[PDB]
Design a protein around this nucleic acid. Structure first.
Lengths: 176, 92, 77, 63
RNA sequence: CUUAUGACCUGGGCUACACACGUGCUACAAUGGACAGAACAAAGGGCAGCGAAACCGCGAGGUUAAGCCAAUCCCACAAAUCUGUUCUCAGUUCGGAUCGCAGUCUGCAACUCGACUGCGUGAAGCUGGAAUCGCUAGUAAUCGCGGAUCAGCAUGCCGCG
C-alpha cells in the first residue's frame, strides 16, 4: 500500500471539502496510467521492437503489446500491420506502485529536474509526462541499457476540469 | 551516480571523476585528497563510507548541474547586452 | 588594469558627473572607446564614434562588464 | 493476471543514501537509491545552496 | 598638383574570408601519455640596463633587494637523455586548436588588437592524390640555449651547443 490509505484519508476528504462536492464519490479519481513507447525506428532496426519490451516488463510486470501500424505511409517507409511502439495499461495496485516508484525515485533522480511542465494538461483533466531518457529509475539496469529512447506516460483522471486535476496531482505530490 | 552521471568502473577514481563536467583534474584530485582514498583505487571496488564521503563533498561543491546553467546564463547575458564579444558568440 | 583601479577618461567622467549630479539628460558624445563602463554609466545613452558616425547606445545595468568598443563595431561588410 | 506471462511482483524496501525508506511492489526484492524525494533539493522547499547562489550579479564592485 | 597629389589630430584599416596556393610549427600514439629521482652544455647580453637572494601566489608573475659598467655578479637550475611508478591499443590518461570564466608581463588603453597561466571540455585528425622537396658526416633527423626589431609582442631571422 503506502498510497491507497494516504489518498483515501487525505486527498479525498480535503479535496471534497475544498471543492464543495454534493456527493462523496464526486471527487475526481485517477482511473489509469497508460505508458506508450512509440518507437518508429523498427523500420531500420527490426530488433528495435524487442527493445523497450524487455524493459517494459521490468518497469511493470504487465507485458506490453506490440502495436502495429494502422495505416501505411511512404514518407516513413511504413506498411499497415508492421509493429510500432508498445502499449501498457496500469489499473489497480500496479498504477499505485508505479506512481509511488515514480514520485520516490524517478523525478528526484533526474539531474536537472525543476518545475515540471504545467502546460502538459490535455485541456480535459488528463496529464501527460514526456520522458526522453530510457534509464530514469533503477529498474532499467544502466549496464544493460544501450539505447536512450525515453518514454511517454499518460495519466488519466475522472476530473471534469483541469483545475481540480491540478489540485489532485499537487496534493498527491506532483512537484509542479 | 555521485553527480547523476555514470562513471567508468574499470578505471582509477582520479580519471573516473573527470568524466563529470565541472570536475576536472585538479578538482577531482582535491576531492580525492579530502576524502582520503589515496587516489589509487578502483571505483567498482569501494565501500559506503568513502562513497558517501565523495557524494557529500560533491553536493557541497559545484556540480555540472549548476555549471550547465551558470555558463548558459552568462552566455545569454553577454549576448543580449550587445557585447561585440557576444555578437561573435552568436555568429559562431 | 588589475588592482590599479577601473579605467575611464577624465573628461568623460567629469561630463558624466555633471550630468548625474542633477538628472540624466541628452546623449554624452565622446571618442573614448577605451573607457570601461561603470555603474554611473547606467541610464546615460552614451554615443561612441565608430570612425565615421556616433552610435548612441543606452547603457543598462549589465553593461558594466564591457567596453564601449564592444558596442561600437568598426569593420563593414 | 495471465499465468506466467508476467514476472512475479515482490514487495521491496526502496532505500536511499540519506536513510529514507520507501516500499513499493517491484520486481527486484530490494532497490538501492542515492537521491529519494526528500533528498532531491527541489522537494526540500527553497534549497539552501540554490537559494544562496541564485543572487543576481552586482558588477563585482568589491575591489 | 599646389588654400593641395602638401601639412596637423581622433578613430578606423593595414589583422575581413564561401576561397586556392607557397613556407613553417603542432598532431594522429606504445621508440608512446602522465608522475618521482639524477647528470652534461656551447655561445651572447647587461646602466633608467641586467637583476642574485628572501617572501607571496598551483601558476604566468608581484614586493624588499645583493651584485654588475662585467673571465668577478647576474641573465641562467638547458631539454632531449637515463633509472623508476603508472596506463593500455581507444578517437583513447593521444593532440591540444576552436571554446566560457578567472588571472599574470607591459603600457594612457592588448575591446578591431600580443603572449602567457589555471580552471571544464574538447573536435579536425588514426599517416594523408597525382606530384613534389632537402640531405653523402658530425651531414640527415631531432632537443634546448642567446641576440636583433622591442614599454609589450617570433612556429620567422641570425648564431650556439
Amino acid at each position: 500500500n503506502r498510497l491507497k490509505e494516504k489518498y483515501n484519508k487525505e486527498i479525498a476528504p480535503a479535496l471534497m471539502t475544498k471543492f464543495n462536492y454534493d456527493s462523496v464519490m464526486q471527487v475526481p479519481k485517477i482511473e489509469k496510467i497508460v505508458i506508450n513507447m512509440g518507437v518508429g525506428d523498427a523500420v531500420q532496426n527490426a530488433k528495435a521492437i524487442d527493445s523497450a519490451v524487455e524493459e517494459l516488463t521490468f518497469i511493470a510486470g504487465q507485458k506490453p503489446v506490440v502495436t502495429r501500424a494502422k495505416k501505411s505511409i511512404a514518407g516513413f517507409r511504413l506498411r499497415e500491420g508492421m509493429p510500432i511502439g508498445a502499449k501498457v495499461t496500469l489499473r489497480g495496485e500496479r498504477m499505485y506502485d508505479f506512481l509511488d516508484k515514480l514520485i520516490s525515485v524517478s523525478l528526484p533522480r533526474v539531474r536537472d529536474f525543476r518545475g515540471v511542465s504545467k502546460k502538459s494538461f490535455d485541456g480535459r483533466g488528463n496529464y501527460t509526462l514526456g520522458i526522453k531518457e530510457q534509464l530514469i529509475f533503477p529498474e532499467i539496469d544502466y549496464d544493460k541499457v544501450t539505447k536512450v529512447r525515453g518514454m511517454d506516460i499518460v495519466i488519466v483522471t475522472t476530473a471534469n476540469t483541469d483545475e481540480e486535476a491540478r489540485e489532485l496531482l499537487t496534493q498527491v505530490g506532483m512537484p509542479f | 551516480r555521485i553527480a547523476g552521471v555514470d562513471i567508468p568502473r574499470d578505471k582509477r577514481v582520479v580519471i573516473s571523476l573527470t568524466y563529470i563536467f565541472g570536475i576536472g583534474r585538479t578538482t577531482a584530485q582535491q576531492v580525492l585528497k579530502e576524502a582520503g582514498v589515496s587516489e589509487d583505487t578502483r571505483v567498482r571496488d569501494l565501500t559506503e563510507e568513502e562513497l558517501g564521503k565523495i557524494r557529500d563533498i560533491i553536493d557541497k561543491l559545484k556540480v555540472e548541474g549548476d555549471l550547465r546553467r551558470e555558463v548558459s546564463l552568462n552566455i545569454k547575458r553577454l549576448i543580449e547586452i550587445g557585447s561585440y564579444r557576444g555578437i561573435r558568440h552568436r555568429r559562431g | 588594469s588589475l588592482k590599479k583601479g577601473p579605467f575611464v577618461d577624465g573628461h568623460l567622467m567629469t561630463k558624466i558627473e555633471k550630468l548625474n549630479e542633477t538628472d540624466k539628460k541628452q546623449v554624452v558624445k565622446t571618442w573614448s572607446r577605451r573607457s570601461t563602463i561603470f555603474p554611473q554609466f547606467i541610464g546615460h545613452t552614451i554615443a561612441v564614434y565608430d570612425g565615421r558616425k556616433h552610435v548612441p547606445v543606452f547603457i543598462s545595468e549589465d553593461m558594466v562588464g564591457h567596453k564601449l568598443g564592444e558596442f561600437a563595431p568598426t569593420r563593414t561588410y | 493476471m495471465k499465468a506466467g506471462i508476467h514476472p512475479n511482483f515482490k514487495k521491496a524496501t526502496v532505500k536511499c543514501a540519506c536513510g529514507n525508506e520507501f516500499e513499493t511492489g517491484s520486481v527486484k526484492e530490494e532497490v538501492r537509491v542515492e537521491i529519494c524525494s526528500e533528498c532531491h533539493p527541489f522537494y526540500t522547499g527553497r534549497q539552501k545552496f540554490a537559494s544562496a547562489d541564485g543572487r543576481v550579479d552586482r558588477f563585482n564592485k568589491k575591489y
